[PDB]
Amino acid sequence: LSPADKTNVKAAWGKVGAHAGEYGAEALERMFLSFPTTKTYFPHFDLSHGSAQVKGHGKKVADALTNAVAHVDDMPNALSALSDLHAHKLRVDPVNFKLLSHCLLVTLAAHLPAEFTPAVHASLDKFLASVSTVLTS
Amino acid sequence: LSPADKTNVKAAWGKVGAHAGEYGAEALERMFLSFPTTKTYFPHFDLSHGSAQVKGHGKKVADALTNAVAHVDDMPNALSALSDLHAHKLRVDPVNFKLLSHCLLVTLAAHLPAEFTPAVHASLDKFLASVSTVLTS
Amino acid sequence: VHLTPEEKSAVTALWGKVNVDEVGGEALGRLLVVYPWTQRFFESFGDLSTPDAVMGNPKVKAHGKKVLGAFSDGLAHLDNLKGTFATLSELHCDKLHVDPENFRLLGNVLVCVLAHHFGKEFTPPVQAAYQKVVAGVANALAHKYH
Amino acid sequence: VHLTPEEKSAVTALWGKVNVDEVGGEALGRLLVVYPWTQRFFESFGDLSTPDAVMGNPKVKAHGKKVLGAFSDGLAHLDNLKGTFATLSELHCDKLHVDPENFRLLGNVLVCVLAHHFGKEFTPPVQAAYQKVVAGVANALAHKYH
Ligand code: HEM
Ligand code: HEM
Ligand code: HEM
Ligand code: HEM
Structure with a gap:
C-alpha cells in the first residue's frame, strides 16, 4: 500500500464505520450465491439466506478487516492468527480470496456510492489483495 | 521467504553464475514462444531467435535476480527502481510475471536437474512470486 | 450462459435502466484506473495518467459505449454467445x-459499476445472475485463445 | 486446440520417451509441494506433511499414473479434447x-517435470507446443464450469 492507498482505505473504512459487520455478512452471502464452490469450505454452516451463522461470521471477517486498517503498516502481525487458519488448516485456494474481495468491493459499491470513487476503488482493491496475501502466506 | 527458502534459492541460483545471460535470454524466449501475448511489451525489440537484444535483456533480468537473491530480506529496496519501471512506467500485467516466473523455473529445471528438487522448486517459486509482488507494487 | 426465466427477468429489468452512454465508459475507465496495465492497449486515447484524466477522457467514454453495446447484444443471445463474440474474439485474441x-476483470468492474449505480437494487441474486453473464462474455471473448 | 505439424512433431517425439509410471506422480507430488492448498483435495492420500513424504507417497504415485494417462488420452485426441475430458470435467467441477x-498450475508443473527430465531436449519451441497442449487440457477440464 502506498501512503495514498493507506489514506484512501482509512477514509473509506471510516465511512463504513459501524456498518462493517453488516457489510461483511452481505459480502459472504454474495460470494456463496455468485461462486457456490466457496460453500464447500463451510460444511457445518447454515448457508441459507438470513443465516445467523453467515451473519455472525461476516462480523468476524469485518472485525479482522477493521483491525487490518488500524494496523495497515503491520498487517502480517495484525492478522497472524488468520494466516495459519486459512493457509494450513483450511487450505483455502488463493483464487477464493479474489472472489470474496470482489464481493466485498461490490458490497461497498452498493452501500457507499459517494465514497467508492475510482481512486478509492483502486486503493481498496490493493488493500484487500494485501490482506489476502497475508492470509495465504 | 523462510530461512530454508532463502538457503534453497541461494545454492540453486548460485549455480547459474556466468550463465546468467544465457539462462535469462532462454527464459525470455520460452515466454515469448509459449505465451505470445507477452510480446506486446516488447514491440521495440527484435524477438527472433538469437536476437542480441533478447540476449542483452536476458542478462539484465538474470543479474537483477542475482541482486535480489543477495538482498532477499529487503527486496523492496533491492528492486525499488525496477518496481517503479514495471508497475508505474511500463505497467506490466501481473499475469505476465507468473508467465516469466514459470519460464525461469523451466529454464532452471532444464539446466540444473540435481538442484531442482521438489523442495528447491517450491522455494524458487516463492522467491519469484515475491520478486513479482515487489515489481507489481 | 443459461439463465432461468426468473434470472433473465431480473437481469433485463435492471439493464433497461442502465445509462448506455455513461456506464460503459465508467466500467472501462475504472478498469484502466484499477488495473493500469490495461492502459497499454489504449495509448492512442491520449492522457490516461490520473483517474480524473481517464474518467473524463472522451475516447474512453466513446469506447466504453461500444463495449456496453456488445454486452447488450450478448444479453440478447446468452445461450449462444459465439453468435455475438466470434469476430470480437478474433480481434482481442489474434490482433490485440x-x-x-x-476480460474477467472488466466483467467484474462492470458488476461493481452496476452495484455503484443501483445500490440496494443490485441484490445478491441479481449479482449472481450478472456474474454468470460476465463470465460467459469473458469466456466467449477468449474463444480464439482456446 | 489446433497444433501445427511442427508442434505435433515436438509433442509426439518427446512423449514416446516419457516414463508413464513415474512422471505423473512426479508432477502431482510437485503440485502438492509447491501449491500446498491443493492438498485439501487429497486428504485420503495420507502423509503429505513434507516434500519427501509427498514424493514417496504410494497414493500420489498411483494417482499420478492415472492423471498422466488422461494427459496421454488427450494427446491421442487433440482435435476433440472437450469430448475426451467431459466425464473428468463433470467429476472435478461438480463433485470435487x-x-x-x-488445472493450469498442474499443467505447468508437468511442463517443469518434462524440462527437469529431458534437459536441453526440452527446447523453448518444444515447451511452447506442450504449453498449447496443457492449456487445451485445462480448458477442456474446465468446460463444465462454463
Ligand atoms: C478478506 C479475507 C478474509 C478475512 C478477513 C477472513 C477472516 C476470517 C476470520 C476473522 C475468521 C474467524 C477466525 C476465528 O474465529 O478463529 C475466519 C474463519 C474462516 N474463514 Fe476466513 N477470512 C477471509 C477470507 C476467507 C475466504 C476467501 C474463505 C473461503 C472461501 C474463508 C473461509 C473461512 C472459513 C471456512 C473459516 C472457518 C469458519 C468456521 O468454521 O467457523 N475465509 N476467517
Ligand atoms: C522476474 C521478473 C523480472 C525482472 C527481474 C525484470 C528485470 C528487468 C530489468 C533489470 C530491466 C531493465 C533493463 C534496462 O535497464 O536496460 C527491465 C526492463 C523491462 N522489463 Fe522487466 N523484469 C521482469 C519481468 C518482466 C515482465 C514479466 C515483463 C513483461 C512481460 C517485463 C518487461 C520489461 C520491459 C518491456 C522492459 C524495458 C526493456 C527495455 O526497453 O530495454 N519485465 N526488466
Ligand atoms: C470483456 C469484455 C470486453 C468487451 C465486451 C469488449 C468489446 C469491444 C468492442 C465492441 C470493441 C469494438 C471493436 C471494433 O470496433 O472493431 C472493442 C475494441 C477494443 N477492445 Fe475490447 N472489449 C472487452 C474487453 C477488453 C479489454 C479487457 C481490453 C484491454 C485490456 C480491450 C481492448 C480493446 C481495444 C484496444 C480495442 C480497439 C480500440 C481501438 O480501436 O483503439 N477490450 N472491444
Ligand atoms: C489438469 C489436469 C488433470 C487431469 C488430467 C486430472 C485427471 C484425473 C483423473 C484421470 C482422475 C481419476 C478419476 C477416476 O478415477 O474416476 C482424477 C481424479 C481426481 N483429481 Fe484430477 N486431474 C487434473 C487436475 C486436478 C487438479 C488440479 C486437482 C486438485 C488440485 C485434481 C484433483 C483430483 C481429485 C481430488 C481426484 C479424486 C482422487 C480420489 O480421491 O480418488 N485433479 N483426476
Whole structure:
C-alpha cells in the first residue's frame, strides 16, 4: 500500500464505520450465491439466506478487516492468527480470496456510492489483495 | 521467504553464475514462444531467435535476480527502481510475471536437474512470486 | 450462459435502466484506473495518467459505449454467445493479444459499476445472475485463445 | 486446440520417451509441494506433511499414473479434447469443486517435470507446443464450469 492507498482505505473504512459487520455478512452471502464452490469450505454452516451463522461470521471477517486498517503498516502481525487458519488448516485456494474481495468491493459499491470513487476503488482493491496475501502466506 | 527458502534459492541460483545471460535470454524466449501475448511489451525489440537484444535483456533480468537473491530480506529496496519501471512506467500485467516466473523455473529445471528438487522448486517459486509482488507494487 | 426465466427477468429489468452512454465508459475507465496495465492497449486515447484524466477522457467514454453495446447484444443471445463474440474474439485474441484474465476483470468492474449505480437494487441474486453473464462474455471473448 | 505439424512433431517425439509410471506422480507430488492448498483435495492420500513424504507417497504415485494417462488420452485426441475430458470435467467441477486455475498450475508443473527430465531436449519451441497442449487440457477440464 502506498501512503495514498493507506489514506484512501482509512477514509473509506471510516465511512463504513459501524456498518462493517453488516457489510461483511452481505459480502459472504454474495460470494456463496455468485461462486457456490466457496460453500464447500463451510460444511457445518447454515448457508441459507438470513443465516445467523453467515451473519455472525461476516462480523468476524469485518472485525479482522477493521483491525487490518488500524494496523495497515503491520498487517502480517495484525492478522497472524488468520494466516495459519486459512493457509494450513483450511487450505483455502488463493483464487477464493479474489472472489470474496470482489464481493466485498461490490458490497461497498452498493452501500457507499459517494465514497467508492475510482481512486478509492483502486486503493481498496490493493488493500484487500494485501490482506489476502497475508492470509495465504 | 523462510530461512530454508532463502538457503534453497541461494545454492540453486548460485549455480547459474556466468550463465546468467544465457539462462535469462532462454527464459525470455520460452515466454515469448509459449505465451505470445507477452510480446506486446516488447514491440521495440527484435524477438527472433538469437536476437542480441533478447540476449542483452536476458542478462539484465538474470543479474537483477542475482541482486535480489543477495538482498532477499529487503527486496523492496533491492528492486525499488525496477518496481517503479514495471508497475508505474511500463505497467506490466501481473499475469505476465507468473508467465516469466514459470519460464525461469523451466529454464532452471532444464539446466540444473540435481538442484531442482521438489523442495528447491517450491522455494524458487516463492522467491519469484515475491520478486513479482515487489515489481507489481 | 443459461439463465432461468426468473434470472433473465431480473437481469433485463435492471439493464433497461442502465445509462448506455455513461456506464460503459465508467466500467472501462475504472478498469484502466484499477488495473493500469490495461492502459497499454489504449495509448492512442491520449492522457490516461490520473483517474480524473481517464474518467473524463472522451475516447474512453466513446469506447466504453461500444463495449456496453456488445454486452447488450450478448444479453440478447446468452445461450449462444459465439453468435455475438466470434469476430470480437478474433480481434482481442489474434490482433490485440489482450490477456484473457483482463476480460474477467472488466466483467467484474462492470458488476461493481452496476452495484455503484443501483445500490440496494443490485441484490445478491441479481449479482449472481450478472456474474454468470460476465463470465460467459469473458469466456466467449477468449474463444480464439482456446 | 489446433497444433501445427511442427508442434505435433515436438509433442509426439518427446512423449514416446516419457516414463508413464513415474512422471505423473512426479508432477502431482510437485503440485502438492509447491501449491500446498491443493492438498485439501487429497486428504485420503495420507502423509503429505513434507516434500519427501509427498514424493514417496504410494497414493500420489498411483494417482499420478492415472492423471498422466488422461494427459496421454488427450494427446491421442487433440482435435476433440472437450469430448475426451467431459466425464473428468463433470467429476472435478461438480463433485470435487476444484477451481480451474489449478488445472493450469498442474499443467505447468508437468511442463517443469518434462524440462527437469529431458534437459536441453526440452527446447523453448518444444515447451511452447506442450504449453498449447496443457492449456487445451485445462480448458477442456474446465468446460463444465462454463
Ligand atoms: C478478506 C479475507 C478474509 C478475512 C478477513 C477472513 C477472516 C476470517 C476470520 C476473522 C475468521 C474467524 C477466525 C476465528 O474465529 O478463529 C475466519 C474463519 C474462516 N474463514 Fe476466513 N477470512 C477471509 C477470507 C476467507 C475466504 C476467501 C474463505 C473461503 C472461501 C474463508 C473461509 C473461512 C472459513 C471456512 C473459516 C472457518 C469458519 C468456521 O468454521 O467457523 N475465509 N476467517
Ligand atoms: C522476474 C521478473 C523480472 C525482472 C527481474 C525484470 C528485470 C528487468 C530489468 C533489470 C530491466 C531493465 C533493463 C534496462 O535497464 O536496460 C527491465 C526492463 C523491462 N522489463 Fe522487466 N523484469 C521482469 C519481468 C518482466 C515482465 C514479466 C515483463 C513483461 C512481460 C517485463 C518487461 C520489461 C520491459 C518491456 C522492459 C524495458 C526493456 C527495455 O526497453 O530495454 N519485465 N526488466
Ligand atoms: C470483456 C469484455 C470486453 C468487451 C465486451 C469488449 C468489446 C469491444 C468492442 C465492441 C470493441 C469494438 C471493436 C471494433 O470496433 O472493431 C472493442 C475494441 C477494443 N477492445 Fe475490447 N472489449 C472487452 C474487453 C477488453 C479489454 C479487457 C481490453 C484491454 C485490456 C480491450 C481492448 C480493446 C481495444 C484496444 C480495442 C480497439 C480500440 C481501438 O480501436 O483503439 N477490450 N472491444
Ligand atoms: C489438469 C489436469 C488433470 C487431469 C488430467 C486430472 C485427471 C484425473 C483423473 C484421470 C482422475 C481419476 C478419476 C477416476 O478415477 O474416476 C482424477 C481424479 C481426481 N483429481 Fe484430477 N486431474 C487434473 C487436475 C486436478 C487438479 C488440479 C486437482 C486438485 C488440485 C485434481 C484433483 C483430483 C481429485 C481430488 C481426484 C479424486 C482422487 C480420489 O480421491 O480418488 N485433479 N483426476
